[PDB]
Amino acid sequence: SSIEIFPDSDILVAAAGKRLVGAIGAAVAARGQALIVLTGGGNGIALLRYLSAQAQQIEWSKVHLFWGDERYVPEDDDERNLKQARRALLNHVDIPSNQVHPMAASDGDFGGDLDAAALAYEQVLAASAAPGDPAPNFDVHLLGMGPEGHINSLFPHSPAVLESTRMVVAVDDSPKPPPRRITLTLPAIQRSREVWLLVSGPGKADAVAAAIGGADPVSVPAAGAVGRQNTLWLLDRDAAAKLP
Template identity: 35%
Template sequence: MASASANTKREKIVFPTEDDVAKAMAKYTFYLSKKFCKERGYFTIVLSGGDLVLWLKKLLAPEYAETEWSKWHVFWVDERVAPLDDTVNSNYKQTLDSFLSKVPIPTSNIYAIDQDCAALGDAKGAAILYEECIKKLVNQNIIRTYKSSGFPQFDLQLLGMGPDGHMASLFPGHYQIKEKANLVTYITKSPKLPPKRITFTLPVINCASYNLMAVCGEAQANAVAKVFKDDFNLPSARLTADTQAIWYLDRAAASKLPECL
């Protein structure tokens, strides 16, 4: 595959509370779902784990009842390699229980990691099979490609950042951030537990049309300040998008930005 590079300027909006961030994220998702369902009859949305799992519940509000759920195709930007019924570790299982099982998205449009690899803790196998799954959907034209690069282009990715500045399972100082050829890679010694994970690579993340990074809480404030100073040692500072890369912050997460001090 040819290399891909998307380059938008980083934008941000600071909201008073975490609840406001979650509500705004739901609104943004609803708007983009409407746009892409109308334009191409599909909406390809990529989720993360962490707090986002709970924030997604805002999409269950009555004002979003017209969402065309049957046109959604749901992926994970990263996933812990844990059994698919593991309520503590599996992003899929947690999101299924709190949100996905409550909306009529066809089960076949929800792309969890391979069940056997998940059960066996086979991170490499899970990454290979997830990449194959994505390539298949690109061939079926369900996932678009970024210009002529052949790289998948998702409509929207909802991302979170850890206090160390990681996004997806791309951690500072770990080689996965440098991976450019594969779409999906894996880590077996993740600094955030559990240790085995698969993750989209940076070129795939940055080819998305819209990337929304939602960050709340004081624990992330130092990392947010570094990102907005362009400290590219933090994987999250490398986030771009084809159309828009926007950060939604609550006041606590934004508290160390120069304009908020």
Template identity: 35%
Template sequence: MKLNIYNTKEEVAIRFSTYFSNLIGKKKNLHIALSGGSTPKIVFDELATNFLEIDWSGVHLYWGDERCVSPSDNESNYKMTVSHLISKINIPEENIHRVLGENEPLKEAVRYSNLLDALLPRENNFPKFDLVVLGMGDDGHTASIFPHEIHLWNSENNCEVAVHPDSGQKRITITGRVINNAKEVVFLVTGENKKDKVTEILNKNGSYTDYPASLVAPKSEKLIWFLDVDAAQKIDV
């Protein structure tokens, strides 16, 4: 595991974008699972504005989780990514593999699971992303696996239907076997509201085992955290 701590969330976006650009430059074809949230939004803006040298022709984009809403809904992770990144770059349309949030959730979880099996290379008999980008909620959830459904992490399926604990909204999420089989996994975590869970997970104290984010441990051992000082202020470095 590698920790990168920067002064601001904007610097996190710049540093991650540099890492991301370098990763794309090393391999012709890449399969990448994206995250939603406020920090990826800043990252997408940075990539679209200041990393024009990136060749997107061999990059395939997927989503680690998606709300069960239409692609035109303001809560759609896909819509956010289109607005802040996809609409501003030259990437083949056939390289965009969205979760169909408008579909019946259980059927869509199966369809997307099958899509990952069909399109991704395999290792350990599981689909293998080159990169999975994750966020973390202030409750310690990651992707759309929440503490009250932490059992979904160990599902035998590539994808599951999750339920938000407060709103009851259904979401499609990839599971732990896919996340931990990735070649590289990155956490993008910013904001003071994340500091308590970040501290418990990285220091391995408190109730850290209750948080799905604590279960991220790729077999490749390539786990990178990009944090701002607000989120990292209480960890033992």
């Protein structure tokens, strides 16, 4: 468990970027694949653009991509985490499409049955896992965090953050638009070897401090965002200002 502080989000993003490049290379060398969980949010998307500039250092044929959450809106909508990832990275690197695993869109197979869409993604994770595991042991789960400490689409005092069995659940009721999302749960996040939170800005500072101070994840979800081998808070100065 570590905190690394940078002057701003640009430097933060580039630092995460080079670290992920090494993390991917390491995972390929040891295991012949790198299992990476992507996030939406400005820092998450900027990190993807960084990877795009380094594409030559990354053996894309061996990279496998999942999402921590997704907005349940139409496929071509700008609020889609997948679409933003496509523009930032996917449309311009040679990753095999059968190794890219997106969550469903609202105009896909499942309509109003959001639970079915989450369960479908869960089946995908189970299939992607090593034998006998509910999901991959993700090399890196990337995260942003909202001003209230939410990660993926796991909000304070929500049914989604209380989930202790399912890898993926429906979020019907997000207090931040769009209202419907599909999300990985804390147990899913906690399978990751490493979890990295990329958090910048004075609006996130109080939540950061409470999360690092050991708050109940039902109150500050980011507190449950803990990797099996490490947990890396990558912060700008403003996001760090309330730490002791």
